[PDB]
Amino acid sequence: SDPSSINGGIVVAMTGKDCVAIACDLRLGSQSLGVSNKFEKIFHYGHVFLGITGLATDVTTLNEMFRYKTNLYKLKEERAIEPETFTQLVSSSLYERRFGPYFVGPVVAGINSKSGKPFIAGFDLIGCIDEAKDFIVSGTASDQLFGMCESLYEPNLEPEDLFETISQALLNAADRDALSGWGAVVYIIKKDEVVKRYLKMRQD
Amino acid sequence: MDIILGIRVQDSVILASSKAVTRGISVLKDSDDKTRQLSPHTLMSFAGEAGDTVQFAEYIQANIQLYSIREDYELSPQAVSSFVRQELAKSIRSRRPYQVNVLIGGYDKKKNKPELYQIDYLGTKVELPYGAHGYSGFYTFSLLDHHYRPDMTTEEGLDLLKLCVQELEKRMPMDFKGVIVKIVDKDGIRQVDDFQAQ
Amino acid sequence: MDIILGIRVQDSVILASSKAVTRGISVLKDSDDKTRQLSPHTLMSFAGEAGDTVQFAEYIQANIQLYSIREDYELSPQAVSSFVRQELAKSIRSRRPYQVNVLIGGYDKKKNKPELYQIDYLGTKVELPYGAHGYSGFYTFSLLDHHYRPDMTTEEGLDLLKLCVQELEKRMPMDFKGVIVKIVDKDGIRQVDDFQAQ
Amino acid sequence: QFNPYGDNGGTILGIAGEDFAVLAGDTRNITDYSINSRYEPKVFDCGDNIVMSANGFAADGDALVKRFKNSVKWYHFDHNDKKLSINSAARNIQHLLYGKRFFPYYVHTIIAGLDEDGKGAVYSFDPVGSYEREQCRAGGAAASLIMPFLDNQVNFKNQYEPGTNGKVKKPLKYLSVEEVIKLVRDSFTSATERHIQVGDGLEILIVTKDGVRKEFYELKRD
Amino acid sequence: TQQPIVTGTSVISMKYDNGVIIAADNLGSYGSLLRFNGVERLIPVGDNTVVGISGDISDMQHIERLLKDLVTENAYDNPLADAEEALEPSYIFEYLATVMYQRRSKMNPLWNAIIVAGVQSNGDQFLRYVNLLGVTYSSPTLATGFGAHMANPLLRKVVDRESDIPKTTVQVAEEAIVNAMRVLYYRDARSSRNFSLAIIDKNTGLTFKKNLQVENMKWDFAKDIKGYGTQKI
Amino acid sequence: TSIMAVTFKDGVILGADSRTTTGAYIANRVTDKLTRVHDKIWCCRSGSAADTQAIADIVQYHLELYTSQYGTPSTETAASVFKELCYENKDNLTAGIIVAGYDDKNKGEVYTIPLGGSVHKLPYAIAGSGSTFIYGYCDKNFRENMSKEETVDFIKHSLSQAIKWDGSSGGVIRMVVLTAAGVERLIFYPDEYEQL
Amino acid sequence: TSIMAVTFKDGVILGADSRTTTGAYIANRVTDKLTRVHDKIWCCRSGSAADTQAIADIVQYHLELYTSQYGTPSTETAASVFKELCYENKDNLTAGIIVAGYDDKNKGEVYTIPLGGSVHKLPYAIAGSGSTFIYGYCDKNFRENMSKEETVDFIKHSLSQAIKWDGSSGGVIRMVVLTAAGVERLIFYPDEYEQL
Amino acid sequence: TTTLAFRFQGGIIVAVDSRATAGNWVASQTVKKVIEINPFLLGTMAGGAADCQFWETWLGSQCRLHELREKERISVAAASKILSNLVYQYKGAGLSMGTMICGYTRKEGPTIYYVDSDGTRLKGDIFCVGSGQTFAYGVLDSNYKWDLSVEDALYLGKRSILAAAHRDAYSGGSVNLYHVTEDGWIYHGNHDVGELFWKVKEEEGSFNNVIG
Amino acid sequence: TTIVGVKFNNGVVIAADTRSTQGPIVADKNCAKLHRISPKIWCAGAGTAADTEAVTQLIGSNIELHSLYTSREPRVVSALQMLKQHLFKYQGHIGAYLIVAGVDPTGSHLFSIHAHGSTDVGYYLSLGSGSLAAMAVLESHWKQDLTKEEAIKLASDAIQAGIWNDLGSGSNVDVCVMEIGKDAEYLRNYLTPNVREEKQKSYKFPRGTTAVLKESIVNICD
Numbered sequence A: 001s002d003p004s005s006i007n008g009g010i011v012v013a014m015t016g017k018d019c020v021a022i023a024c025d026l027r028l029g030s031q032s033l034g035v036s037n038k039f040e041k042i043f044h045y046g047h048v049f050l051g052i053t054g055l056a057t058d059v060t061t062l063n064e065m066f067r068y069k070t071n072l073y074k075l076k077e078e079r080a081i082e083p084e085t086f087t088q089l090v091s092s093s094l095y096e097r098r099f100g101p102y103f104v105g106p107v108v109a110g111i112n113s114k115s116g117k118p119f120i121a122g123f124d125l126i127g128c129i130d131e132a133k134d135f136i137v138s139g140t141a142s143d144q145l146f147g148m149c150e151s152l153y154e155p156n157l158e159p160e161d162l163f164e165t166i167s168q169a170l171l172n173a174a175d176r177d178a179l180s181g182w183g184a185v186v187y188i189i190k191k192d193e194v195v196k197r198y199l200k201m202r203q204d
Numbered sequence B, C: 001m002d003i004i005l006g007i008r009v010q011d012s013v014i015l016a017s018s019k020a021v022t023r024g025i026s027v028l029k030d031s032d033d034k035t036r037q038l039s040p041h042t043l044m045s046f047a048g049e050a051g052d053t054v055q056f057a058e059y060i061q062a063n064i065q066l067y068s069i070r071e072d073y074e075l076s077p078q079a080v081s082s083f084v085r086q087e088l089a090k091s092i093r094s095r096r097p098y099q100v101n102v103l104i105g106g107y108d109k110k111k112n113k114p115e116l117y118q119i120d121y122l123g124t125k126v127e128l129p130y131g132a133h134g135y136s137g138f139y140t141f142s143l144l145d146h147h148y149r150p151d152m153t154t155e156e157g158l159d160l161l162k163l164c165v166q167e168l169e170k171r172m173p174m175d176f177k178g179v180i181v182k183i184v185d186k187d188g189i190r191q192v193d194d195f196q197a198q
Numbered sequence D: 001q002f003n004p005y006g007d008n009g010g011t012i013l014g015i016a017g018e019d020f021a022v023l024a025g026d027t028r029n030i031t032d033y034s035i036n037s038r039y040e041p042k043v044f045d046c047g048d049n050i051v052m053s054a055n056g057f058a059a060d061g062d063a064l065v066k067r068f069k070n071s072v073k074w075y076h077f078d079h080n081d082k083k084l085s086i087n088s089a090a091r092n093i094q095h096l097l098y099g100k101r102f103f104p105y106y107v108h109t110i111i112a113g114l115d116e117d118g119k120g121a122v123y124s125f126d127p128v129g130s131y132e133r134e135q136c137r138a139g140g141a142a143a144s145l146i147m148p149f150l151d152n153q154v155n156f157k158n159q160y161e162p163g164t165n166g167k168v169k170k171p172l173k174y175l176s177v178e179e180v181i182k183l184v185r186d187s188f189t190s191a192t193e194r195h196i197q198v199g200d201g202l203e204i205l206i207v208t209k210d211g212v213r214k215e216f217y218e219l220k221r222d
Numbered sequence E: 001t002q003q004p005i006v007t008g009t010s011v012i013s014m015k016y017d018n019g020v021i022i023a024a025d026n027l028g029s030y031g032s033l034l035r036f037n038g039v040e041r042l043i044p045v046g047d048n049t050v051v052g053i054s055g056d057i058s059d060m061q062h063i064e065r066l067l068k069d070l071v072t073e074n075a076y077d078n079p080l081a082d083a084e085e086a087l088e089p090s091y092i093f094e095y096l097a098t099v100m101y102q103r104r105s106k107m108n109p110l111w112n113a114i115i116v117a118g119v120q121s122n123g124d125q126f127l128r129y130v131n132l133l134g135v136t137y138s139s140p141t142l143a144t145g146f147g148a149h150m151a152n153p154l155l156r157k158v159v160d161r162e163s164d165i166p167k168t169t170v171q172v173a174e175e176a177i178v179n180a181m182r183v184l185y186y187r188d189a190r191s192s193r194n195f196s197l198a199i200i201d202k203n204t205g206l207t208f209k210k211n212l213q214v215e216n217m218k219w220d221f222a223k224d225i226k227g228y229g230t231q232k233i
Numbered sequence F, G: 001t002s003i004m005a006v007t008f009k010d011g012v013i014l015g016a017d018s019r020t021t022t023g024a025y026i027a028n029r030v031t032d033k034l035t036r037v038h039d040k041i042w043c044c045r046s047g048s049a050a051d052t053q054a055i056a057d058i059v060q061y062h063l064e065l066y067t068s069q070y071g072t073p074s075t076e077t078a079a080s081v082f083k084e085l086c087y088e089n090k091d092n093l094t095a096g097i098i099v100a101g102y103d104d105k106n107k108g109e110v111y112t113i114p115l116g117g118s119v120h121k122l123p124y125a126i127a128g129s130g131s132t133f134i135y136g137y138c139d140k141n142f143r144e145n146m147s148k149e150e151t152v153d154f155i156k157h158s159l160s161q162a163i164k165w166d167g168s169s170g171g172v173i174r175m176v177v178l179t180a181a182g183v184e185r186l187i188f189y190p191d192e193y194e195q196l
Numbered sequence H: 001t002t003t004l005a006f007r008f009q010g011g012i013i014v015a016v017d018s019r020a021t022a023g024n025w026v027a028s029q030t031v032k033k034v035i036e037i038n039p040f041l042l043g044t045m046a047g048g049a050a051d052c053q054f055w056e057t058w059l060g061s062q063c064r065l066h067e068l069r070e071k072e073r074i075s076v077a078a079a080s081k082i083l084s085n086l087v088y089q090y091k092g093a094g095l096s097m098g099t100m101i102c103g104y105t106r107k108e109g110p111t112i113y114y115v116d117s118d119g120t121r122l123k124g125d126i127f128c129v130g131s132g133q134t135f136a137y138g139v140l141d142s143n144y145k146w147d148l149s150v151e152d153a154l155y156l157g158k159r160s161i162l163a164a165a166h167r168d169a170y171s172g173g174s175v176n177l178y179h180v181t182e183d184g185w186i187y188h189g190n191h192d193v194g195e196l197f198w199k200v201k202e203e204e205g206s207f208n209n210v211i212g
Numbered sequence I: 001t002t003i004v005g006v007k008f009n010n011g012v013v014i015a016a017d018t019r020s021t022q023g024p025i026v027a028d029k030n031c032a033k034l035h036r037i038s039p040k041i042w043c044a045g046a047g048t049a050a051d052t053e054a055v056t057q058l059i060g061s062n063i064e065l066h067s068l069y070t071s072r073e074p075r076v077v078s079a080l081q082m083l084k085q086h087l088f089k090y091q092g093h094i095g096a097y098l099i100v101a102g103v104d105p106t107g108s109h110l111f112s113i114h115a116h117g118s119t120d121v122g123y124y125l126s127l128g129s130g131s132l133a134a135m136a137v138l139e140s141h142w143k144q145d146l147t148k149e150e151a152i153k154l155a156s157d158a159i160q161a162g163i164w165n166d167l168g169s170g171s172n173v174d175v176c177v178m179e180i181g182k183d184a185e186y187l188r189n190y191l192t193p194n195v196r197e198e199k200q201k202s203y204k205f206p207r208g209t210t211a212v213l214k215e216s217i218v219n220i221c222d
């Protein structure tokens, strides 16, 4: 019935000292039936990352759409798109389907290549932008994530520290959600490098 | 719904699909082949709404055959599945959506590896070692999760399916009248005419 | 619904009833005996609502056994069926009606003739050479209308039923897991333990 | 048409220590988007060293707590002033709730105390009587925001020994009443930040072999 | 289960250092028709309690009768009926609360929102609310229906927490309430300009004021407003 | 809402309450329900505030373009443009409009356009939820060819009764006088009309 | 329906239209909505004809047994018996009743029992679908302590307006005068009240 | 929920998961789904927690009263019918329960009765109830043998709940095991699925699709 | 949401709270409800956030283009006309409830627009769930001929009534002042009366606490 509770899944992004992290679970189910434990919800265009929760088919479609748009952008602008600009592109793309929206909960994360300033943002299915300075949550366990984040989070964490925090937030929220879990992946992002780590969690 | 099963072993993809076609109170046919060859090395099985099912399959088949002729080339299984996903993803937001679920089994001659794709009517695609649509997964996935191995031979795959079908024939309320099984490998697509007692 | 069949031949009444008990998505049992012996020469088969089915059968059984003891006599099949019809006819206008359909097969030792009674949950009773409840009649009555003869032997009756069951196993969508068959004659009630391949 | 039920918000939390137990709850009572009171006690001392809270529909919560206290009173009258053990109260509450199985007390109830061995004890109930003894349980509006936190910080879930390659689970050393209170307070200030029904004040009731003590802290009033 | 026919709107109240004040307008609406204008919705019980009622008026009248009976009954075989054994505001409230919850539990509610204001025998102020669902609560200020949204915010600016009660005088309190009544007359389409107000002070006792009116209203600026956007005249 | 338009000896007067509600809440207590669509052609609005504004705005636009080409429009022509909009879009509109204008040849005129989009020319008209309460009063007290003072009085008393019984009516009473002399804006506060 | 009761100097007068409808059809055009429950205690009936008759019949029965034991009942006591029935059975009744009686100590009194079963004592009361149209008129023209002639006139004019606008009201206007002098029955035909 | 019970040479194996969910919310991972009616009788719980917990505990009270009255152990047939008949009285009221009554009497031997709120009462050798039943049936049906050893039987049950806990979003937490012998039932521990999964994967080679 | 508009002797001021909700959960504790249509015409929005933002930017874009085309400063009545005709067209499906204010060549203006397309004019206005708490304050303290400072205070106090009394409102107070002869001044977080108290404990985890299965570097450079 609710397009956002069919496939399940979660995404969470956090800002730290000169870095940002975006994490997600790997589950894809059909209500109670688990179907895939390798459905990643994070994608990237250049140095900009996008995680999408919600109806899987729309998650896939949106990624293909943004890949398409960011490619043409690079060809014309002759530079990779930035976090702030991409966020605007996401918002306007979603609102364009105001009365027949994609059932997703997007999350943007990245570092501005020119200002080095960390950036994260969330959106509702029709484009409303939420530009938090701390964290952003999305998915079937978003209430749980809000609980984890509001407590665990603190400003200016170093990459190695933010990793522990973002992971504990994700992992413990997913274990209180029937439709989340079955694997997890965390992205630690810095101006120069990006590390991707798969976590070990329950498989039930 | 009908039984649609698929398993990807070492060097091939196997699709098993129920043969019954029930309309209301009666089983109208017990030899229905719920499959369409999209290209020499790609096979698609399907289940869903009465007329949409075949209309969709044949529509996809027509498009792939046209591409093959135009380019004198056979699209990779991954390319074919993406084309199919997009068609379904369009359909889901149209006036009257195609209520069809599919399994796409293909052998990629360039990578020399078999591939199995599961896509539901919403355009939800995922690649797997084995998959199914409807309630089929509910009875068989525990068996597949147990006995599945990436290095299985085609013969081992057929034995595992046979086991799955037996579980289905024991616990499922409906009589689906057995299944037709097809293998997809480096040499093409062939049908196992002997599964009625393999 | 479950398969409930009955045929009255020359000197006996035969009841065939499906063995499956399906609850939702799964077949919980495939050896269910949907019958209760009401007296040494009277058998009742039943199909309907999950709990009502056995509760009704056992309730009727209790009442007949009590009558037998009080009178040291066995009520005629006709008497037993009228008692059962009345019970259902009361139930249909009560708070929560018994949704149970029955076939009552009995051998009348006084008349020395077998009798088959069909009664639905509304208390609709009719006496017949053969009968059924649910969709069973839809697939089998054309066969019975054809091959039935009042002078058939018990063996001929079993062959005719076997034919009926085969038609059911071919055209009916659900797998009822075969049937348990019981004969009721001048000597009592016995079960044909060999119909899985007679 | 008339709806016999309502929702007064609120969130309550019960944590069982080794030889103590706490039952906390915000003091905000609401109706839709209006605050009925910034201070309306929701956790009660029911005698015999038992604290109880029935969160959800306040009229139902009051009726239940009131019925239970009266149960304790008669337990004394009928069993020579015998003390009602926490396990016995729990079973009794199950029957109180199940008595209205077809017109339920729309509440999530939790009681706290010490079992017969002096150990900390918490019991959480279904609106219809299903119950379990538990280590800790959040109930009400922000329950989904607090439980994950507690799984992590009280039962050390998903936490391993640094260097063990997640091969060695972090040891379950048990918390003191002071450490528990900290978790409770952080749980609520956090819930107050993200849930519009949580706020105004936090009242905790601590149970030890010495009886029942109370602590109070303010929460944001927005 | 029923539906209210003749209804009374808001009932606002608050407690100050020496007592409590409560008020309610004199209207009995019939849907959008402001049908009755001499309706008293403040019910004094003895001389230490006033029960303010909103909602269905036929039920209110029924609660009135219940209240008169409580008084009669409490007097029976009670030589201290006008002393140590007189009705306390808390007794009156627990009674009504009991009835309200029993009636909702039988799926046949007294369609009302009630506030009981009074002073206990030991001088303590008493202010508690109970409605058709049997729900009850206390707060330094309490208002029903419409006044919950517009009066509480104002009254809470005077008494925001418990420590503010001892710092509030009858003058400040009565002032706040009278102002709230005016605001309610400005924005509540089911309000009346006339209203009754009562004070229960632990020293001056019960003071019941009838026939009050909203005064000092600001409407002059209305003359400067024309059109709904671009119109100039 | 309570609105009315009354023709008299020297022309016509429009009157209205100033209340807009969203349920029991008074969203605006100083609303101006008297709208100008031309120098001496105004209207009284009831029903949907959004609908009546959009209608009025379009009528004003039409009469402006009319004037530019054919000079000043007759009150009848204005009522016709209103009608066209209300009738042709009856399924999507909730608008009860009273059109009133002053012509030199025709003097004052009043046309009432009720829900269905029909038009009715009358000596005077009342509309809005509050009008139901003053049908009797108005029918007993209205007289043709009244003076400006009498007419202002008739309207003031009528509307004060409407505001009195109707919870949907209230605030101040606004009036617009339309005569050869020009356009006059009148307003009456509660303290004045409540004790009539 | 249009019914009203008005107290005046010498007592009280009840008035009503005589129309009962079942949809658009007038089932009875000479209906008597003024019912006697005691020598000098009558009522005006509106809402369900079946419900109000059953109620009145039971009230009459009650007041008769009351009289047999405790002598003549006060108008207030009569209104209370009506109330008890209307309030306690609010879920199954549709009755708007005006109770009016003449006491020597209390003179004339009027109690209106609206739908929910609440009671309201007033100098005068109006009810019935037709009353909505005369709220303004009645509020402007009612005066306390009027004479019998004035009161008959007030009622006659009020109801004629109600009948005028309300399709549910019509026929003749009936009145019942209750004073120390006794009980008087008045009736006014269309040709008379229509041209007032 | 996933609960199962099966009959074999060594008696009866009873295995259940321990997850409780209300929608997508995981209310608990440590719920008891087995009721110890008494030292010889076990009951499983699926569907409504309150309904099962309440009536199965009540069942124990009725069984105890029987033994005091008849000075003899109650039969599984009779204990199951008490619950069955009670539940039938409530048919239509909304009770929600899928249950297995398990016991081992001298007179009957290992016995399992499936009893649900529809009034159905079925004697059988293998039963699985809950949103995860199909998963457990697959494992159970292909590895069940009457001659299984108590050690192997216990594992089959544990493994079957594991299969379900993995695929069913509504199943998981831990596995609670029981062995029922004529002398009573023997509890066989609480096994966290988190740990149990990785262990079984490595030692068995199954769940090849999951990356560990 | 609580948004208000208040006219003062030489201009207009608008204010709003900063809470954004998804049901009972606070999605954003510091969103910005004050939008710019043009340099000196600002808007406060309530209702559907994506809508108030989208509608504000659309008309803003056209207003800019109109200004460039006419070589004139944008007028508030123009933004009002374009907004209402747009909202009317969508029959309320675009859930935008706005308070539009600003100064232009003709003076200072204050208006409100509802989702269905109707507009209102007044000296003081408020919209949102906090609307009633805010209006109660305005009806109690407004007066004609307010000074700039008085207006800011009145407006600011109105939002507070909402933050504290409405569950739909909270966090901070944003303000924007538009005076007839000066630049419009946007005061983001003019008030921040809801700062979270220091947490009772630090949840910083010891590195290595999280079990990792696989690790790899992600390629960003093309």
Ligand SMILES: *C(=O)[C@]1([C@@H](O)[C@@H]2C=CCCC2)NC(=O)[C@H](CCO)[C@]1(C)O
Pocket (backbone or CB within 6 Å): F001, F002, F019, F020, F021, F022, F023, F031, F033, F045, F046, F047, F048, F049, F052, F128, F129, F168, F169
């Ligand atoms: C009157 O008809 C009406 C007014 O709010 C509008 C306001 C401005 C111009 C048209 C009339 N319309 C309604 O829908 C209101 C009542 C809503 O319950 C009211 C006051 O009757």
Ligand SMILES: *C(=O)[C@]1([C@@H](O)[C@@H]2C=CCCC2)NC(=O)[C@H](CCO)[C@]1(C)O
Pocket (backbone or CB within 6 Å): G001, G002, G019, G020, G021, G022, G023, G031, G033, G045, G046, G047, G048, G049, G052, G128, G129, G168, G169
């Ligand atoms: C007036 O209320 C009413 C009358 O028909 C009855 C008749 C006799 C005594 C009680 C009043 N009631 C109705 O329901 C009628 C209208 C039906 O559409 C009417 C005329 O209003």
Ligand SMILES: *C(=O)[C@]1([C@@H](O)[C@@H]2C=CCCC2)NC(=O)[C@H](CCO)[C@]1(C)O
Pocket (backbone or CB within 6 Å): H001, H002, H019, H020, H021, H022, H023, H031, H032, H033, H045, H046, H047, H048, H049, H052, H130, H131, H170, H171
């Ligand atoms: C399993 O049946 C069930 C469990 O929550 C209960 C819990 C305790 C004992 C009985 C089983 N029941 C449900 O209703 C859940 C699913 C709701 O969609 C769950 C987890 O399957």
Ligand SMILES: *C(=O)[C@]1([C@@H](O)[C@@H]2C=CCCC2)NC(=O)[C@H](CCO)[C@]1(C)O
Pocket (backbone or CB within 6 Å): I001, I002, I019, I020, I021, I031, I032, I033, I045, I046, I047, I048, I049, I052, I128, I129, I168, I169
């Ligand atoms: C206020 O209107 C509102 C806010 O969340 C949005 C946020 C940003 C700009 C527009 C206003 N909107 C709602 O829908 C909420 C209330 C739902 O009952 C809230 C918090 O009032």
